[PDB]
Nucleic acid binder design. Sequence first.
DNA 1: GGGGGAAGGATTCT
DNA 2: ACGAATCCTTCCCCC
Length: 343
Amino acid sequence: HHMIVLFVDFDYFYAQVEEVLNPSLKGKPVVVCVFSGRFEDSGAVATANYEARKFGVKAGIPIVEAKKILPNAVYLPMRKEVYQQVSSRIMNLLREYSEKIEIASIDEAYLDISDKVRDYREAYNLGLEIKNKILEKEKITVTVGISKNKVFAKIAADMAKPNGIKVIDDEEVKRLIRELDIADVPGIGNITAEKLKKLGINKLVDTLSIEFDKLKGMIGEAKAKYLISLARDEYNEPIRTRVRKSIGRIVTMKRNSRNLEEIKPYLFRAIEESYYKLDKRIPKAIHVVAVTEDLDIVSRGRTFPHGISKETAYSESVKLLQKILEEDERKIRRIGVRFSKFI
DNA sequence: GGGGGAAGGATTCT
DNA sequence: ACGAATCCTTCCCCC
Ligand SMILES: Nc1nc2c(ncn2[C@H]2C[C@H](O)[C@@H](COP(=O)(O)OP(=O)(O)OP(=O)(O)O)O2)c(=O)[nH]1
Ligand SMILES: [Ca+2]
Ligand SMILES: [Ca+2]
Ligand SMILES: [Ca+2]
Ligand SMILES: [Ca+2]
């Protein structure tokens, strides 16, 4: 009659993996950190388990502030490659439940189980079978969301987290479209949430009382059509494979700088790691990205009529870096590169 | 008018 | 006080 989407989101992923790899951590507050090297505990928290998030320690806060709060918790350096491989294996399993699987991030995917189930009961049961299987195979708990479309599947999981499973039937979808704060709609951050308030829109439904063109004028057409769809209970994007369209590395310097020679080593380090990661991929475009001292972001790039060799990336990146320092007077704090337009 | 594409910045999100 | 997709606006070349 319509689509049946099942969304899967692993719980406090990075930290749970640290637990799996060292179960003696369970029960204790675990904090996976991103150490910037600027000083002792400079950096931010990538994520934390619930035992630590109930005290305010979470993704985003400085490491120093988290220690102010939980001086005795366990602080571990982020090990991105490890969580990715654990993630891949879990994605492979889900893959065994549908052909139409959309891997949205390192720890979440949507499955189109439209022709694997009939009605939500079976759907609900396919959920447990999945949770139970990932738990057994990898000992990772995950939350499951099930609804008529990706957006509501996602919302379903946010509401059941953690270690939960939830269904939002078409009847209930019609309540959310009236009761759900527009801000909690995926893809609607602070900037959009506030533009929406100023226009009197606090709930999805409200997007129906406003003139379309005004919406578009205030938050863009893409975002306007998006909200109106969900609002008209007509949203139906299909689950679909998504391949990486960009690869890059950005690093924080020990000190902010404008001296080309102090910045080069970091930039070159970024290019190295990036190329290593490109694997058998050849980019036609390169961008140099810089985070200025006032945590602002400037970038300069160029697209070549052919692929980019490492030597070409080294040379071109230095020129783009020079463009930045020239057109922007602020000191540079973070420097990096991003490659795209793969051949 | 429109199409096509490329830069650079804005937003979001995990 | 730390990697990546989508979208918006402007600028440009041109039939
Ligand atoms: N470096 C960095 N990584 C993040 C950040 N937020 C999330 N991540 C990465 C590592 C986290 O383990 C993974 C988390 O995905 P989610 O934020 O959706 O949930 P998490 O797994 O954090 O726990 P949860 O979904 O809230 O139960 O994504 C962030 O702000 N900075
Ligand atoms: Ca998660
Ligand atoms: Ca997630
Ligand atoms: Ca939000
Ligand atoms: Ca998130």
